[PDB]
Each structure stands twice: as structure tokens, then as C-alpha cells.
């Protein structure tokens, strides 16, 4: 019984540890995509059937 | 239960607490036996003149080394920020 109970604990909490090991990486990479960046140029992209329209600022 | 009313009474856990009188148990006796092997009572405390000499001489040496310890503590916490720790460079 004692040995079996420990295995069952591991059957549950070894996966839990792995998930926790991914959690921090997941937060960081999500934060990275959603970062306020000092962008200096804008390209507008519209999708139509069936082609892609692109609007870009013209040099003055 | 009954907290905050005229019916206030000791909870069961406070009553179980007071049921543990620890009679016959002495878990700190080892410290007293060991302190008694220093023979401070037979040598200093028992006689009044010697008890006075322990308070005086022990207060002279205790005061000095207490100061010494806390001086070193201070010299360490404030390392690099004390006048002695930063010799001054004269302008050319």
C-alpha cells in the first residue's frame, strides 16, 4: 500500500511539475508578443477574395 | 463560542489547552544541570562581596566587548561609506 500510494502520487504530480515548468516560459513568450514597441512605419494589409491589398505611406 | 455576547465561553480548544498541565514533565532541565556545572553559584553568587564583584567585573568586561562587537557590525554594514574606508584624493 505505501509504495502504491507514492506511485499514484507521482502519476499525478510528475505531470503537474512538467506543466509548472512550461507555465513560466508560456507567460514570458506571451508577454513578448504583446510588447509596446516604438514602431516607426505602418503597413496596412487588407484581405479580399482572392488577393491582398497593401496600403503604405508614400515618401514626401 | 458566543464571542462578543453575554454567552461568551471558552471554546473547546482553549479548554483542551488548559487540560494539558504537563505535570511531571521537565524538558529544560538539561540546561540547568549544565549551567550548574559552571560553579558560578559556589564561586561568585553565594557570597555578597563576590556577587558584587561579578556584577562589577562582568559589567566592565561585558560593556567593553559588547561595544567591540557592535563596532565591527557597524564597520561591516557601512563598508565603503565610512571616512576611514575611502581615502581622499587631493586635486592636482
Amino acid at each position: 500500500y505505501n509504495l502504491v500510494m507514492k506511485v499514484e502520487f507521482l502519476f499525478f504530480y510528475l505531470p503537474t511539475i512538467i506543466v509548472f515548468g512550461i507555465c513560466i516560459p508560456v507567460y514570458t513568450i506571451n508577454f513578448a508578443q504583446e510588447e509596446v514597441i516604438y514602431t516607426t512605419m505602418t503597413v496596412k494589409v487588407t484581405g479580399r477574395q482572392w488577393y491582398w491589398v497593401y496600403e503604405v505611406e508614400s515618401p514626401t | 463560542s458566543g464571542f462578543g455576547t453575554s454567552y461568551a465561553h471558552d471554546p473547546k480548544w482553549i479548554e483542551d489547552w488548559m487540560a494539558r498541565k504537563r505535570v511531571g514533565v521537565d524538558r529544560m532541565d538539561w540546561f540547568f544541570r549544565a549551567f550548574n556545572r559552571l560553579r558560578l553559584y559556589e564561586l561568585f553568587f553565594k557570597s555578597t562581596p563576590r556577587f558584587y564583584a561579578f556584577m562589577v567585573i562582568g559589567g566592565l568586561l561585558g560593556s567593553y566587548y559588547w561595544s567591540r562587537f557592535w563596532e565591527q557590525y557597524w564597520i561591516r554594514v557601512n563598508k565603503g561609506r565610512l571616512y576611514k574606508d575611502v581615502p581622499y584624493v587631493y586635486p592636482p
Partner: protein, 90 residues
């Protein structure tokens, strides 16, 4: 109890575990409060956690840092290896 084999909880804390139904409820409540607290005390707090001058430097950080500092490796590691794009063609 967090990350606790409940067989151990049953053995070492028999009186706290006597009512197993109540014990189960506390298990749920404790972990519910932990999840709730994480969102509003670790993630939500605004304008906090941006003190990058206070990066924790553990005892292992210093062991490895001093070892490399004693030798020239720390200086060599920090040195910029290349700051030009093109090599010169003889």
C-alpha cells in the same frame, strides 16, 4: 495541503483528518484561494515588478561569478568578440 501525499496527512495528523468529508472541502477551498490569490496578487498588481536594479543574485550566482572573476574568463566572456561586419581581403 499542497503537494502533500494525503496518506501522510492521514497518518501524522489523525485528528485533523478524522472527518474526511470536511478534509476534502478544505483541500478544495485552500487551492481555490491559492489560484485566486495568484491572479490578483502576482499578476494583477499594477506598476510593480519593474525594479531591474534589484535582480536577485543567488549564492550560486556569486560562486560561479567569483570563480570566473578570479581567472580571466569573466573579462574574456564580456569582451566583444567582433564589432565589424566585413573581414579585409588580402
Amino acid at each position: 495541503s499542497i503537494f502533500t501525499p494525503m496518506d501522510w496527512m492521514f497518518y501524522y495528523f489523525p485528528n485533523y483528518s478524522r472527518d474526511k468529508v470536511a478534509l476534502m472541502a478544505r483541500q478544495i477551498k485552500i487551492h481555490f484561494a491559492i489560484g485566486f490569490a495568484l491572479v490578483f496578487l502576482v499578476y494583477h498588481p499594477p506598476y510593480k515588478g519593474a525594479d531591474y536594479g534589484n535582480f536577485h543574485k543567488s549564492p550560486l550566482y556569486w560562486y560561479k561569478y567569483n570563480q570566473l572573476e578570479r581567472s580571466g574568463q569573466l573579462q574574456e566572456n564580456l569582451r566583444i568578440k567582433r564589432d565589424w561586419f566585413y573581414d579585409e581581403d588580402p
